[PDB]
Each structure stands twice: as C-alpha cells, then as structure tokens.
C-alpha cells in the first residue's frame, strides 16, 4: 500500500536545482533521504521512495 508523507527541513534551503530533478543535488537529496529513511523503517515494511516533490518552505 502507499502513503502520502510530507515534512519540512531547516537543514537545507530551497534551491532552483531542487525546483527541478534535472540537477544532481535534487537526485542525491532524494537518495540521501531515501537512505536515511531506510534506517528509520528497517522494520522491513519499507519498499522504496516514489513520486517525490519539493517546494519552498
């Protein structure tokens, strides 16, 4: 099943690069988050990250 997850980060600021997945910062950021998430959900229920979208906060 799929769930909708939303959150805000202060460690990073909104960047034009993040306003477009055409940048490595955006792609890596997803990965870093995906990597970090895998640590939180190690329970195994985790499957992967999909349909990511970023926005200014």
């Amino acid at each position: 099943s799929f769930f909708f997850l939303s959150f805000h980060i202060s460690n990073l600021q909104f960047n034009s690069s993040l306003e477009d997945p055409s940048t490595d910062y955006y792609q890596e950021l997803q990965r870093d988050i995906s990597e970090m998430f895998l640590q939180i959900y190690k329970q195994g229920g985790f499957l992967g990250l999909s349909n990511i979208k970023f926005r200014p906060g």
């Binding site: 769930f3 959150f7 980060i9 990073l12 600021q13 998430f37 640590q39 939180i40 195994g44 200014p56």
Partner: protein, 47 residues
Amino acid sequence: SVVVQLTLAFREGTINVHDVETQFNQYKTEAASRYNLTISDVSVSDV
C-alpha cells in the same frame, strides 16, 4: 527551509500509518544525528 511531498510505499498488513509516525518522530532526532538533517514536522495520510 524546504517542504517536501512524496509517496512512501509500505508492505500491506505490516506497518500502519500510526507506526510510521511513531518511528519517524522518534527518529527525527536520531536520523538527524546520523545524517545531520533537521526536520520540522512529518505527516502521513492513507488517503
């Protein structure tokens, strides 16, 4: 800061939205300690 909205996929009959909030909120500090990331708040909906 940045507001991110995505879709998180979990196995069915394994983890509930309630459990997700529990680990994520509990991991906000530790997951943050490991990656040095800062989170303001998290929200998970099944709809």
